[PDB]
Every structure is written in structure tokens, then in C-alpha cells.
Automatic annotation (TrEMBL), chains A, C:
Mg(2+) binds at T40, E70, D144. GO terms for molecular function: ATP binding; ATP hydrolysis activity. Signal peptide: none annotated. It comes from Staphylococcus aureus. SUPFAM superfamilies: P-loop containing nucleoside triphosphate hydrolases (SSF52540). This is ABC transporter ATP-binding protein. The keyword ATP-binding applies. The gene is ybhF_2. Keywords: ATP-binding, Metal-binding, Nucleotide-binding, Transport.
Automatic annotation (TrEMBL), chains B, D:
GO terms for cellular component: plasma membrane. This is Phenol-soluble modulin export ABC transporter permease subunit PmtD. NCBIfam families: PSM_export_PmtD. One of its GO terms (molecular function) is ABC-type transporter activity.
Length: 290, 249, 290, 249
């Protein structure tokens, strides 16, 4: 499943403009953009709903695709179990009791799986939508705002369960969603949509050079600290007038402070300036609205 | 495989049909209406020895059951577009074509079951009352007519629902197409200097002659009508497959 | 509008437990809670849709209330401008041309103000419903998640417009919504709801923002380090779950690192950042899940 | 003020009625059906000098226009409950009471509009044909009957739509309640030895005698029937005000 040089047009308005995508050694990808830029259109192209792609898409037939396109699609007058059984039989290979039971048990829908979907709440429908989508046993899962009616704690719980299923079954997810602070907790890479194209693509494990960590130390220790950092990692900017040293972004601060605390050194201050999804998204997108 | 997927879909829509209170509310209304109509039409307008002629009951039961089965078909085929869960099915080409084959098998099965409903109700009516029963070959040909009628109208409304993605409009068009042509025809056809010519040509437009012979108590067909109807159903099936595989949401 | 000793119950289930409320020297107030905890019930409690509370709810008849509850409320068949005019007559005093023009111009709905609601998307229809709420010229304005499926730029500009109207008219607003970072963007004071009560009440007036340091450590050592820092460096507020300890503003970490080294306990992660409502929210509401 | 808010709401509800195309489609369909029925009813089974008596057309137009006007009333009343926007109109107590008064005022104004449409259609029928014109007092008292019918049924259906907050049940229940009594009385009332007693006693149950009397071409009321009908309307209005101010949504 790869997309190369994809352009889709509606009359005279250009939605997609020469986009390529490939799942290369990554499990969770995030899609971020504004409203009406063609996020649902790119997901539909990646899904199969739209047919006039005007390019080439290579997808194996044995692989199943599961998706959610923003509002839940369920049977309102009928119950959740009816929906689960039907989309497992209709879209997937079949129904298995152990596998379905594990799915039900992991999500936490035991008290209300036999209640009518009409009586559900918004977060209940969102979870039911994710579960019905997952019932296909897909190889690629594509969710459009799966967390558009649930609380932040609920968001952490749903994403952690989703990651756990990423590990229990080798599966790859493509996610388009707002609330980038919720996407950054568990994600491997992010793609940014602007002016109909994905302007920047960021892989979070390797990081980018714009992410920075600023460490300030004493004047007597400045030489020794600079020597150690020059020995161990790459140094980009050093400012003697400022007293500030710039190092690469690190998720864990443990080993660095261990080394300095073992050598009896205490920095006066530490903080980080980083090009996170909020900074890159806002700097790129403040250019066309304000 | 795909065969199990299609058969599983036909079994599950019919299962969803059998588990609703409206299906039996509909059976109770049709049986009550047909029994009152038959009793009024034959047991008091000449005061016989309670003999009943089955052509009127046949036509009335067939008419009522067709307009009820038609509404059941429009609701079944428009359910997914009404709730928008049809978006979940239009994913790959193989599922989109298995979808069209499965809907066709579902339409065939709903028509056969409703024809069986017609058979049981009319048989009970014949058992209760007194007269000469009708032959089975008439009922088999009648079964074929139910199949043809329901297949044609369900595919036409499917094309319409694909173009519009609105459900109230389809419900209005279904009622409009069934009840407007028999209602408009007597008040306008006898008027022109072209009426006899248009009336004979009215036997080739599928909507027109299928609805005209819909209220008749016996059907009869020519070779040209059979070929035109079969060709139209086949063309709608092919057109549905091509449009479902070429449309974008 | 003030509430005093409100206790609403549905049979055996209790939703509110002896709450009191009042807009005290605050202009924008946020209501935060989980999903299905009684957030929509509280919105109904404050606004007035429920009468059988066995108490006293104090509102004056000359002040109108324009509101937003979960789903947007609009006439989907008719147009947006028709909705605006109709709800201006039914709920407000009359038609003001300049005022109405200002509302459309500030929100940005003019290109599509004459188009049918069925052609809208979710954020635009919700924003128009918010404009309908301001059409009433209320003294109290209540919104239930106004920014659910809208991009960050859209949320910041709409809230900014709301503030410019909070200065144009003397108005007081309560917003119950997720996206607590959007809440710190535009809010003056926040209240936290758990088990029908407002557990904590944080007031922010100046841009001091109470910068804080985060220390993470395992439980068997967290007790001793928590105790030790309470005997030494004066504490303001405490967050147990996220591990936030708030000493006064300290420029230099040397005395902290030296004391923590002499304590033999060590942090996994240390950072300084502006405080937010997310840490407090997690402290209040992790109690039901675990 | 409150007076302007009630009158403006009734005015805007009427404006909402006058813009939709379904109102003029309903008028077109009803006028075509009444003209065909009138022609069938007087110009064919006897062969007069094209003289038409208007009691039968009166009764037919009354039944068709009342059932259509009732459906228009149920749809307009339950519009907000269907879309859920009703939860926006139940903010204060004074608003909830002005809401109920305004809905009743909308019912009286809508009733006046349907009475005027019924008068104009019958006048156009009279203009097309030839015969003996009716009198104004019949239409004025007919206006009273429209008012009584629509207020009573609108308040009953209003109580049901507040209690259930579901719309498809209201439409099916309203259709069933209007159309079941003429359908049900012949198949069951003539059986008992208590039938005559139950039939005279049906003159005091408001549903039974109001529904029975829509089909009749002339209405005749006693003092007890007039008092009980007006009292039932008043009791429903009082009950609606009390329940809207004591019900929790």
C-alpha cells in the first residue's frame, strides 16, 4: 500500500497536489492539518472510497483495511453486539469467540454491549466505532478523529489500549486528528498538510535538528562541561556571552544529570526550546490565516 | 471467500427483517384489509350462497402486498445511505461488486418470501371460504412477476439513491412512481388525438406497463415485453456495477 | 445566577452532591470533568432545563441566557441567516443591524451565511450556533465543547473574538470543554468537578503563571522525598499523581540537586514549565480508574 | 415583550409554512382529488343536468383537509423535538409558559388559515359548477369546529410529544388515532348486546365522537358535548403548562 504522485481535483479546486506516502519501518503515523484542506479526501484516497485517484496505488488484496471517517457509523435502532457481529461477518474473514471476547474485554464494554446504540453516549459511540473498525482484522487501520467526544483521560486510555493492540498483533495505524498534544504521547511520525500538500514530514524517534535543549552552567565549570559535551555528542551552538549551551533533544534527562551529579556539577538552569508539532504547525500555518 | 461473504449478507438482512415488529404489523394490516375487502366485494353485493370469486381477492392482495413489499425494499436498500454506514462498505472493488451481487440475491430472496406470504394468505382465504381453487402454475408465473417487478424497481431506486444520497426523496419517489401513473392515466389518456397510439406505446416503457398490469388480476405477456423487461433488468445491473465502481463520495 | 446546596439525583444514582456556585470576580470560567460524570447534566442544571432540584437557583428575569449544549442546535432544513433572525426574535429584544453585522464579521461567517446548513461542516455549524448564542445579547453565556472538531487556529481566533466581545458588552461566560490548553489560552478562573462537587478552585489574574518544576520518582522513595521537601522548602500546592511540588521561584537548582544527592533519591525527569490545568485534572480524576 | 415574543413566534411559524413547497403540493393534490371525487360523485351514476349537491363534497373535503391539516400540525409541532432544538426553548419558566401559549396561538391561527383555504377551494368548486350556494353561518360554525378539533388533538399530541420526545411514534400514533375509529366501528360495534349502549355513550368520549364526526357532513352538538370538549381543551392546556413547568428534561 503505497501512494506516489497522487493528485485529485473537484472541478477547478485542487485538493491534493502530487503527494507520496509509504509505510517505511513505522507503526503509528499522524496526519495534521486545518479544516476543509482535504484530510478526509486523502484518507478516502488511501482507503478506497474515492475512485478517481489519477496516479498509481499498490495494495495487496489479501490485506484488510479498517477505517473510521469522522462521525461514527453504526446501526442506531439496533444494539452494539448486532453491529459488532455484522461487521465481523461482512467485512472480516469470519467470527471467532475467543478473539472477539479478548477485543470486548480489552476495550471495557461488558456492561453496555447488549444495550441499544441509540442509548449510548458520544464517547461510547466513538469506542464502538473503533472496535467495529478493528473487527475486520485489518493490516492498516485509518481513524478520523476517534477521540472527538471523549475526555483527555479517556483519550490516554484509548490510545494506550490501541498501542497495546499494536503490540499484541502486528498492525499499522494511520491517524488524522487534531489535538496534537494527544497525538504526541503515542506516535512514531507526523505529516503536515498545508495548501493541499504535505509540506513537512517528521519522524520522531530520530528527531530533527531544530529541537534544542539549553543548559546553563557556572563560569568555573563552563570549560569542563564544554569538554565533556564535545567529547560525547555533537555540539551545534555554544554561546559564551549568553552562557548557554545547545544540545540535541532527549526524551529522558536521567543519564545526563547522572553524569553531572556523579562528577559534583550542578547546572544553574535547564529548559528546552523545541520544534514540536505545535511550533511547526503554528509557524507554517500562521502564514495563511493571519 | 466472497461467496460466503455474499450469502452471509443475504442471510443477515433477511434475519434483520424477521426481527422487527413492523413486519408483523404489516402482515396484520394486509390480512385485515384483504379479508374486509373480500367479504364486502363478494358476500353482500348480490347475496349469494356465500360463493367468492378469487380474481378480486387475488388482485387486491397482490396490489397491497406489492406496495408493502416495495416500501420494505426501499427501506432495506436505503437504510445504509440513511445512517451513512454505506461509507464503511464502499472500500474495495471486490467488496463493491460483491455488494451489488449480494443486494441482488437479497432482492431475489425478499421477493420469493413475500410471494410465499401471498401464497399462504390466499390459501387460508380459499380454505375458509367456498369456491374453486386456482392452479399452481398461475402462482408460479405470479412468483416470476413479483421477482421481475421488485428487481426492476429496486435497481431503479438504487441508481436514484446513488445519485442523491438522501433518503426522504427516495421514499417520496417510490410512493410517487407507484401511485401516480394509475392515478393520472384515466383522467388524461382518453383526451388526445394520439391517445390510442400512446396507449399502445405505453406497453413498452417498463415503468408504465409494469404499473398498469400491476392492478390487473391476471397478467399476460408478449415476447417483446419479456425481452425488453429482461434486457432492462440486465442493463440496470451492469450500469449499477459500473456506477458503483466509478462514483466518489 | 448563583446556585446554593444543589443536590439532584436520578433514583439511586447521584449526579450532584451539595454544590454551590457563583461568578465571583471572574469573567471566564471553565467546567472540567470526565465523560458521563454528569457534565451535560450540570450544563442543564445551570441553564435551567431541569426544575425538580429541591433547592433555590437564583437568576433574574431581565437577563437572557443563550446556550450551547452537546449537539449544535440549528434548523438543519432552513438557512443559517434564517436561524439567526428567528432566534433573535424568539430569544432577544429585537433586530439590531450594526450589532448583527458585527457578529457575522467577527466570526467570519459572511461568505457562507446564506447557504443551507446541510452543506456545512461540523466546526462551521457549531461556530454559527455560537453566533446564534451571542445573537441573544446574553448576560451569561454557556457553551458545551465549542471546539470539538475544529482546528487550533479556528479555536484561538473564535475565543479571541469572544474576548473582544467580552469587552464590547459587559458579559460573563462559562465554558465546559475539553482541550485544557485552549482553556489556559482564554479563561480567567477554573473549577474542577468530581462526584458532583467542585474540588479545587484555581484563580489566575496576572501573567506570573506560577512556573513549576516536575520531579518523577517511584512510590517507596516518593513518600520520604515529599516529606523532606515539606520540612525544608515551603510548599504552596501539591500534586501527588504527576509529582508536582511548588517551592517559590528559584533561579538556581544547585541547592536542590545537592540536597537531592544527599537524600540518595534521584529523579527520572526534571523540567520547568508553566503550570496548567492538566496536572490538577489528572490528580482529581485518576481516582476512579485505578 | 412577552406579547411580541408570542405573536412573533406564531407569525414566523406561519412564514415557515408559506415558503416550503410541500404546502402548495398538498394544496395541489387535495384540490385535484376533491375535483375528481366531486365529478365522480355527482356527474356519472345518475346522469343529471350536471347539478351537483355539495354535502358529499363538503364531507370529503372536510375529511381530507382535516387529516392533511392534522399532519401539518403534528409535523410543525414536533419539528423542534425531532431536531432536538426544543431543548434550547426550555430555558426559563416565563419562556416555558410563553412557549405553550404561543404554540396554542399558533394552533388557532393555523386553524383559521385551514378554514380559509377550505372556504376558498369550495368557492372555486362552486364557481366551476352550477347549483345552490350554501350559507355563511355554516362556514363560521365550521371554523369553530376546525378550531375545536385542531386545538384538542394538538394538545393531546403535544402532551405525548413532551412525554416521549420521539417523533416517529407521534406520526404513527396520530395517523392511527385519526384513522382507526371509522375503520374499527363496523367490524366490532354491531356484535354486542351492549353495542347500542356503548354507541350512545361514545357521544361523551372526546376522541370517539370528534373522530366519528369528521366524516359526517353536518355537525350537531348538545350543550354537554360543547362544555366537555371546551373543558377537555382547557384541562389539556392547564396540564401542559403545569407539566412543562415541573418536568425535568
Amino acid at each position: 500500500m503505497k501512494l506516489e504522485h497522487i493528485t485529485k481535483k473537484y472541478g477547478s479546486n485542487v485538493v491534493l497536489n502530487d503527494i507520496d506516502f509509504d509505510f517505511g519501518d513505522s507503526r503509528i503515523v499522524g496526519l495534521i492539518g486545518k479544516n476543509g484542506v482535504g484530510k478526509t479526501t486523502v484518507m478516502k484516497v488511501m482507503n478506497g472510497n474515492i475512485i478517481k485517484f489519477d496516479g498509481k496505488v499498490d495494495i495487496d488484496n489479501a490485506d484488510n483495511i479498517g477505517f473510521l471517517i469522522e462521525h461514527p457509523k453504526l446501526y442506531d435502532n439496533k444494539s452494539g453486539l448486532y453491529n459488532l457481529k455484522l461487521f465481523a461477518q461482512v467485512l472480516g474473514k469470519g467470527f471467532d469467540k475467543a478473539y472477539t471476547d479478548k477485543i470486548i474485554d480489552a476495550f471495557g464494554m461488558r456492561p453496555y454491549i447488549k444495550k441499544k446504540v441509540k442509548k449510548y453516549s458520544m464517547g461510547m459511540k466513538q469506542k464502538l466505532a473503533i472496535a467495529v473498525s478493528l473487527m475486520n482484522k485489518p493490516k492498516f487501520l485509518i481513524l478520523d478523529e476517534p477521540t472527538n467526544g471523549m475526555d483527555p483521560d479517556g483519550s490516554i486510555d484509548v490510545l494506550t489500549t490501541i498501542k497495546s493492540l499494536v503490540n499484541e498483533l502486528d498492525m499499522r495505524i494511520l491517524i488524522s486528528s487534531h489535538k496534537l498534544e494527544d497525538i504526541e504521547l503515542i506516535c512514531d511520525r507526523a505529516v503536515f498538510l498545508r495548501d493541499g500538500h504535505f509540506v513537512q514530514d517528521v519522524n520522531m524517534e530520530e528527531g530533527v535538528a531544530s529541537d534544542t535543549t539549553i543548559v546553563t552552567v557556572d563560569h568555573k565549570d563552563f570549560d569542563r562541561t564544554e569538554k565533556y559535551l564535545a567529547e560525547h555528542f555533537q555540539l551545534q551552538n555554544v554561546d559564551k556571552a549568553d552562557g548557554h549551551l545547545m544540545i540535541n533533544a532527549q526524551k529522558n534527562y536521567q543519564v545526563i544529570l547522572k553524569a553531572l551529579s556523579e562528577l559534583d556539577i550542578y547546572p544553574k538552569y535547564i529548559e528546552t526550546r523545541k520544534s514540536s508539532l505545535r511550533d511547526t504547525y503554528f509557524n507554517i500555518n500562521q502564514r495563511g490565516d493571519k | 471467500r466472497g461467496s460466503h461473504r455474499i450469502l452471509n449478507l443475504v442471510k443477515y438482512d433477511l434475519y434483520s427483517i424477521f426481527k422487527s415488529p413492523l413486519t408483523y404489523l404489516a402482515i396484520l394490516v394486509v390480512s385485515s384489509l384483504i379479508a374486509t375487502q373480500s367479504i364486502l366485494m363478494a358476500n353482500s353485493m348480490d347475496n349469494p350462497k356465500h360463493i367468492i370469486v378469487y380474481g378480486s381477492v387475488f388482485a387486491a392482495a397482490k396490489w397491497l402486498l406489492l406496495i408493502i413489499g416495495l416500501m420494505f425494499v426501499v427501506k432495506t436498500i436505503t437504510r445504509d445511505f440513511s445512517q451513512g454506514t454505506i461509507q464503511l462498505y464502499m472500500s474495495k472493488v471486490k467488496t463493491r461488486v460483491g455488494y451489488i451481487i449480494s443486494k441482488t440475491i437479497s432482492i431475489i430472496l425478499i421477493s420469493i418470501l413475500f410471494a410465499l406470504i401471498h401464497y399462504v394468505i390466499l390459501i387460508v382465504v380459499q380454505a375458509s371460504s367456498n369456491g374453486k381453487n386456482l392452479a399452481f402454475s398461475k402462482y408460479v408465473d405470479n412468483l416470476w412477476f413479483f421477482l421481475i417487478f421488485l428487481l426492476f424497481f429496486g435497481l431503479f431506486l438504487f441508481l436514484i439513491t446513488l445519485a442523491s444520497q438522501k433518503t426522504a426523496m427516495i421514499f417520496s419517489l417510490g410512493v410517487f412512481l407507484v401511485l401516480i401513473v394509475p392515478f393520472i392515466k384515466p383522467f388524461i389518456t382518453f383526451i388526445p388525438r394520439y391517445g390510442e397510439k400512446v396507449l399502445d406505446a405505453f406497453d413498452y416503457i417498463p415503468f408504465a406497463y409494469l404499473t398498469d398490469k400491476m392492478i390487473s388480476s391476471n397478467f399476460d405477456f408478449s415476447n417483446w415485453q419479456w425481452v425488453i423487461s429482461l434486457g432492462s433488468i440486465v442493463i440496470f445491473f451492469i450500469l449499477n456495477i459500473l456506477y458503483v465502481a466509478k462514483k466518489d463520495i
